Amino acid sequence: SFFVLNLVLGVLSGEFSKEREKAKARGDFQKLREKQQLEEDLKGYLDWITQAEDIDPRWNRFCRRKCRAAVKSNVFYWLVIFLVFLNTL
Amino acid sequence: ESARREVESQAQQQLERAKHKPVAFAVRTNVSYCGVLDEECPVQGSGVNFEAKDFLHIKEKYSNDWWIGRLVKEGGDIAFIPSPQRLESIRLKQEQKARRSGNPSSLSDIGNRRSPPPSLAKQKQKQAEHVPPYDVVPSMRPVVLVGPSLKGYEVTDMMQKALFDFLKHRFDGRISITRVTADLSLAKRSVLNNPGKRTIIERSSARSSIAEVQSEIERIFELAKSLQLVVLDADTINHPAQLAKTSLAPIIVFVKVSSPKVLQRLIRSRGKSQMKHLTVQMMAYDKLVQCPPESFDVILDENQLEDACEHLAEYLEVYWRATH
C-alpha cells in the first residue's frame, strides 16, 4: 500500500517529466513567456498614455492627479487591507 | 636659455587667473591627434588626443595659431585645443613627410620623374566639398526625443507630453522649451555662397523655407549660453540620419516600444480613426530602431514613468553638473 503507491508516484512523475522535456524541446513555454511580458508592457506603456490624459495646457488636475498618487501611495494599499481584515473579522 | 624660461609659464598663469571666465561657442572635433611629436604649444601639455566630436566649448580669443581652453567633465579644469587653422594646415603636415605623397613610387622605380610632389597634396585644392575643421554647436547640445511614431499624431507626442512633465519638474530652473514649426531635416546651412534673406527679390530660392528654417539657428546655438540642451517639438526627425550631418548633432533620445506587439494596443486603444496612416506608425517606428543608436545613443526601454523618467534624469544629472 505504501511501497506500491511510491512506485506509482515515481513512474508517473518520471513520465510527466519525460513529456514536459519533449514539450520544452518542441517549444511551448515560449508562448507563455512571451505572452506575460506582452501584457506587462500593456499594463506598462498603456498606463503611461493615461498619465498624460490630464496634462491640460475641465479642472481635474487639482484632484485626479492626487487620486493616482493616493491609489499608489501605500496608504490606499494598507487602508483596503485593514478594511478586508475588518470584513473578515 | 632665457628664451624658453622667460615665457614658457605664460600659459600656466593665464589659464588660472580668470578661473571664473565664462565659456562660449563650442567645438566638434574630427581627429584625435597626439602631441608627443606635435606639441607646439606654450601649455606644455601632452596633446589634444581627445576624440572625434569632443565635448568642449571655447571662447578664449588666443593667437592665430592655438586656442588655450577648457574641457567639461567631472572636473572643471582647463584644457587646450588647436586653432582651426592649425588643424587645417597640419592635417597635411603629419603626412608632409610621407615621401611618395604625390605619385612617384618606391617600388624600385627611383628616378622616373623625381621632382617634388605636386602641390595638390596640400590645402591648395582639398576640394572634396570644402568641409571645414572643428564645428561649433550651442553652449549646450540640442535635444531630439524620437518615438514612438510620427510626432504630433495622437499617441506620438502624448508619449512626450508626459515625459516633459517630470522633465519640466526637474527643470524650471533648467527648462528652455521651445516649439519649432520648421524642418531641420530639410535645413542645412551648407549653402553655396548666401542663403535667401530677402522676401520679393525674385530669385530662384526666394519662396523657400530655408529663410524661416535657418532663423531659429540663432534661437539655438550661442543663445544657449545659459546652458541648456533646449528641447523642441520638431516634427522633423523620424530617423537619426538627416539631423546628424550638419553642426547640429542633437541629443537624440529614443523611447523604446520593445517588440512590435505592445504598440498595437497602444495605438488601437483609441479604436476608429488612428489608422489613417496605418503602416508607417508601426513601420516608421521600427524604421528607426533599424539603425544603431550612437545618435539616439540614448535608449528608453522602460515601464511606468517613475523609473522611465529616471533614465532621462540620470543622463542629465551628470551631464548638467559636469558641464561647468
Side-chain angles (χ1 to χ4, degrees), chain B residues 218-238:
Chain B
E218 313 65 346
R219 314 204 323 179
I220 300 263
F221 277 58
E222 201 74 299
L223 173 140
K225 111 250 104 49
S226 120
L227 226 269
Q228 245 120 52
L229 34 49
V230 182
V231 305
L232 16 97
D233 88 1
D235 183 66
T236 64
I237 159 171
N238 270 249

Side-chain angles (χ1 to χ4, degrees), chain A residues 44-73:
Chain A
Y45 308 154
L46 175 275
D47 114 295
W48 167 4
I49 190 88
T50 70
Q51 206 184 293
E53 103 164 308
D54 208 49
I55 293 164
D56 261 345
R58 354 277 112 219
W59 185 227
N60 322 93
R61 173 97 290 172
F62 209 132
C63 217
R64 279 214 52 259
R65 92 174 161 68
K66 277 298 280 143
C67 286
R68 260 164 51 258
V71 165
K72 333 195 202 272
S73 68

Side-chain angles (χ1 to χ4, degrees), chain A:
Chain A
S1 190
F2 282 115
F3 184 84
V4 149
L5 161 95
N6 194 353
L7 305 202
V8 165
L9 275 183
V11 180
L12 261 191
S13 57
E15 189 224 294
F16 296 155
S17 147
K18 207 165 32 67
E19 191 294 4
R20 90 153 310 256
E21 148 206 349
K22 261 186 285 149
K24 145 168 282 171
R26 166 189 62 228
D28 199 354
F29 183 50
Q30 288 339 308
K31 164 58 196 150
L32 183 55
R33 178 49 178 150
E34 85 185 283
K35 167 246 191 314
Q36 273 318 346
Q37 327 165 288
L38 214 55
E39 278 98 36
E40 166 51 63
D41 315 329
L42 289 178
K43 142 201 178 212
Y45 308 154
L46 175 275
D47 114 295
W48 167 4
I49 190 88
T50 70
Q51 206 184 293
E53 103 164 308
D54 208 49
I55 293 164
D56 261 345
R58 354 277 112 219
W59 185 227
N60 322 93
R61 173 97 290 172
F62 209 132
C63 217
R64 279 214 52 259
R65 92 174 161 68
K66 277 298 280 143
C67 286
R68 260 164 51 258
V71 165
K72 333 195 202 272
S73 68
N74 314 315
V75 143
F76 207 90
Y77 162 77
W78 277 123
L79 204 59
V80 56
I81 262 54
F82 188 70
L83 302 170
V84 166
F85 178 92
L86 284 192
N87 203 23
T88 292
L89 219 62

Side-chain angles (χ1 to χ4, degrees), chain A residues 37-57 61 68 72, chain B residues 155 158-159 161-163 165 255-259 261-262 265-266 269-270 301-305 308:
Chain A
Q37 327 165 288
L38 214 55
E39 278 98 36
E40 166 51 63
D41 315 329
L42 289 178
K43 142 201 178 212
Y45 308 154
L46 175 275
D47 114 295
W48 167 4
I49 190 88
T50 70
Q51 206 184 293
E53 103 164 308
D54 208 49
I55 293 164
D56 261 345
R61 173 97 290 172
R68 260 164 51 258
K72 333 195 202 272
Chain B
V155 49
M158 183 144 177
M159 296 291 108
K161 298 200 324 297
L163 255 205
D165 209 345
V255 280
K256 197 94 221 90
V257 196
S258 313
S259 109
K261 207 49 64 207
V262 313
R265 226 162 189 133
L266 268 206
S269 16
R270 284 99 209 271
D301 67 300
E302 248 173 329
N303 275 293
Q304 348 307 323
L305 289 309

Side-chain angles (χ1 to χ4, degrees), chain B residues 10-24 26-27 41-45 47-48 50 54-63 65-73 75-83 134 324:
Chain B
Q10 210 168 358
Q12 267 254 30
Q13 318 157 220
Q14 48 144 240
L15 285 129
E16 215 277 295
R17 153 203 30 86
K19 180 71 109 204
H20 322 117
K21 75 189 101 40
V23 317
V27 164
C41 58
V43 272
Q44 320 167 279
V48 69
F50 291 167
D54 202 54
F55 191 19
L56 82 149
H57 297 11
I58 229 22
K59 51 95 205 163
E60 284 100 289
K61 316 300 285 211
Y62 206 44
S63 157
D65 41 36
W66 292 285
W67 214 290
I68 29 68
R70 280 158 148 287
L71 207 300
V72 280
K73 64 268 189 202
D77 330 288
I78 45 93
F80 173 84
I81 37 64
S83 147
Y134 315 143
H324 72 306

Side-chain angles (χ1 to χ4, degrees), chain B residues 173-191:
Chain B
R174 168 125 286 281
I175 204 48
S176 62
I177 72 80
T178 202
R179 46 180 323 209
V180 65
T181 43
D183 326 303
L184 192 300
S185 78
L186 320 176
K188 274 99 159 83
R189 68 214 44 69
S190 18
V191 194

